[PDB]
Every structure is written in structure tokens, then in C-alpha cells.
Amino acid sequence: GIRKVLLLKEDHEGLGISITGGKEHGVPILISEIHPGQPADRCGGLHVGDAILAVNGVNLRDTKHKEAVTILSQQRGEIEFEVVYV
């Protein structure tokens, strides 16, 4: 149930999506907050409700959600989202 959404934000800065999950919350990094016209309408493929497990090359590290943050933070201006259906 993988779904790749390529979100490349430049200049403007910031993304426009929110996540939470990991071994800390005993959950997967799931999208929980999506601002209108934000990465949901900017990548024409983002949207809360989907389960997240991979970015910029399937990287959702097993610790806490920040394992994704570390992944998305240091990666590149392109956020590749691979999502699974809960």
C-alpha cells in the first residue's frame, strides 16, 4: 500500500504537514495535521489519514517520530512521501 508523493519546497521554506509516531508512541509516523493548500495541495498528493513509513527513499527510523524528522530535516528540499493505508 505504498504511495509516493514528491514534495519539493524551495525558497519559501517550511513544509505544511505534521507527523507523530514511532516506538515512543508505539505507532508509525502518521500524518495528523495538514494545512489547506499546504503540502496537501502543493504536492497534489499529500493528505492526512495515511500512514507514513518512508521519505526521500523510504526512511522512517525506528525510535520516535523524530527519526523521520532527522530524515526529513537533513535530507533535501524534496520530501518524498511513501504512505500506507491504515
Binding site: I17, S18, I19, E24, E33, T63, K66
Partner: peptide
């Protein structure tokens, strides 16, 4: 914020 969850 401090734990590990996040907002992009």
C-alpha cells in the same frame, strides 16, 4: 517538540 514527534 523535545521528545521526537514533529510538525513540518
Amino acid at each position: 517538540e523535545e521528545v521526537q514527534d514533529t510538525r513540518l
